[PDB]
Amino acid sequence: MNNVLNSGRTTICDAYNVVAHDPFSFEHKSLDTIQKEWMEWKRTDHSLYVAPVVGTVSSFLLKKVGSLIGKRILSELWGIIFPSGSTNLMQDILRETEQFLNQRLNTDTLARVNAELIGLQANIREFNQQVDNFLNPTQNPVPLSITSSVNTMQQLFLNRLPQFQIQGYQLLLLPLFAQAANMHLSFIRDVILNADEWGISAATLRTYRDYLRNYTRDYSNYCINTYQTAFRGLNTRLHDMLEFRTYMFLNVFEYVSIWSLFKYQSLMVSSGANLYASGSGPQQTQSFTAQNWPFLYSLFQVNSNYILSGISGTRLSITFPNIGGLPGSTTTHSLNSARVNYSGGVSSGLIGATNLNHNFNCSTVLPPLSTPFVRSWLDSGTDREGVATSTNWQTESFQTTLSLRCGAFSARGNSNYFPDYFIRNISGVPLVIRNEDLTRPLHYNQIRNIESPSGTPGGARAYLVSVHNRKNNIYAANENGTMIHLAPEDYTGFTISPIHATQVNNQTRTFISEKFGNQGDSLRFEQSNTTARYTLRGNGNSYNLYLRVSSIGNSTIRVTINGRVYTVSNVNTTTNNDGVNDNGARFSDINIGNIVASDNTNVTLDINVTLNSGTPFDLMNIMFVPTNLPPLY
């Protein structure tokens, strides 16, 4: 079979109602539809005070880069972020950010920011109108002033952006700055891709190519540094730590991740960074700091390259009679143990108690790729009634594209879901994670049981985490249970997350490393001669294979595909990089060579890395680009 990759728990609903799933639903969706979905999401779902427009803009940028037709971004972008010239969406982003962070700008900055929003909107509209008017006279003369309009707009961007980086409020203004950075970088890209059409000189063109790279670097690093500084000061419960990340990833890093890809055209970003959700409620009490994060995300991405089928676990419903003279009773619905299941018979490590038999299995009854999970309920809580009757409850429930729902207990509380995002993985944590675990991050697909310290388990508790990602172009499950990537139907480029491998050796020495502007995390090889295999469903087109990597030292890359072996020696991004410092990595796009994505064929891509210097190697992105579309720089 194909996308109808099978798995299931029991609940019926027949194929004649959800038998077909579109692996390119996002790409096949119009922007208006996407905008409506985000608006509806805002109205009815658990937004994190996130302004829905951020979702529309990111989706919009993804589509511009994903299609050669997206030569001009600024005009339409302006129409989305400044609807009919209104600054209300930007004003709301700031205000919802203030509410989310519980931080407020002083009166002076507020006033200046507002004036800058008005000016930005005006200046940008003026530029686009001048361009249009020039190409099709219908107003003011505006001679060969396009180059003149470009020079003015550019300087105006440089004068305004800094106002969204005010010391004392850098994190609070980060979402706004990201939107403004979107406008400036989009502007620069427009000049480049419309150079001939706008009468741009060769000298100006060359300068703007450097602008795209240099400003992407400055803006990217600024965003990453601002967020990292704030993240290091965190000390909060899991739910809040994850939401802080989600809020910033949706408002800021989705953009940072697309900026360094503006240099490409007709490149379908098949997936981006994950969004992790955990439950709210009084039960999940452990507090975490940034030092604990590496462990947490290394755990949440276990078996990320496999196809999620469902979970098994131990749910208990105990209602002991109330004694001591009091009336009523006390009930507790809990999930004491859990384990996530995947295609190929693979499972994650146990979560919670390791000495209990599971009494239930929750999965996508139908094929896991046909009706994947998209929404989860993870909140806990306590209900009280009568005089002394109480009920402690957990949810740990999931629902598929088909309204099929399953889990430990009835759904209630906040549900976790994001438009065009699928729950591609599930994880969880026990009531208390031992410091011994927090101090030792898991390696790639490491299977380790995460249970409460002795004197706390026996029955313990399991609190699940849903992993949301846009990833959808999955042809089917490979024979080993992993993802087979589906190439675009037409001659469009596409990416493959290094995390979605068919298989990787030296797994104990290979780790997933967090990234902020890499459309997902990277794969760090710490052992020389490690090979990562990827499998994709070709479309018969030829592409130039580019590997986005970071190597603070020398390394050798050996790529085997189509019976061809490409060797790139002396790979070192210490100083020869695009300038972006992403959590220590300094990426560079290595042109491996021309490859053929054999039609209706499962093509294997083997990436072997030699760690000459002994220093780790970061495999950050795999991108196939149309051979006749070289990068802008």
Name which of 539, 23, 61, 25 is nearest 267 in CA terms.
61
Name which of 395, 175, 172 is nearest 277 in CA terms.
395
How far apart (Å, rounded) are the C-alpha atoms in residues 128 and 134?
10
How far apart (Å, rounded) are the C-alpha atoms in residues 520 and 446?
19
Helix (H) or strand (E) holding 582: strand 581-582
CB neighbours of residue 168 within 10 Å: 11
Select the CATH number that applies to the domain covering 264-272+485-633 from these four: 2.60.120.260, 3.40.640.10, 3.90.1170.50, 1.10.8.60.
2.60.120.260
Q: Are strands 389-393 and 329-342 parallel, antiparallel or unpaired?
A: parallel
Query: How many angstroms from the chain centroid is the CA of residue 484?
Result: 19
DSSP string, 332-366: EEEEEEEEEEEGGG-B---EE-SSS---EEEE-SS
DSSP string, 182-213: HHHHHHHHHHHHTHHHHT--HHHHHHHHHHHH
CB neighbours of residue 424 within 10 Å: 26
Residue identified by tokens 């004197």 is 455
How far apart (Å, rounded) are the C-alpha atoms in residues 37 and 421?
12
DSSP string, 56-112: HHHHHHHHHHTSTT----HHHHHHHHSGGG--HHHHHHHHHHHHHHT----HHHHHH
Ordered by start, the domain boundaries in the chain are: 30-263, 264-272+485-633, 273-470
Q: Are strands 397-400 and 564-571 parallel, antiparallel or unpaired?
A: unpaired
How far apart (Å, rounded) are the C-alpha atoms in residues 402 and 399?
7
How far apart (Å, rounded) are the C-alpha atoms in residues 515 and 537?
27
Resolution reading in Å: 2.2
Domain 30-263 is found in CATH 1.20.190.10: yes
- Architecture of the CATH domain 273-470: Aligned Prism (2.100)
Q: For the chain, give me the number of helices (H) and strands (E)?
A: 14, 31
Residue identified by tokens 């900026």 is 259
Cα dihedral 224, 229, 232, 235 in deg (nearest 10): -110
How far apart (Å, rounded) are the C-alpha atoms in residues 396 and 227?
30
| Alpha helices for 574-627 (secondary structure H) | none
Asked if 436 and 337 touch (Cβ cutoff 8 Å), the reply is no
How far apart (Å, rounded) are the C-alpha atoms in residues 372 and 477?
13
Name which of 404, 278, 554, 515 is nearest 14 in CA terms.
404
CB neighbours of residue 570 within 10 Å: 10
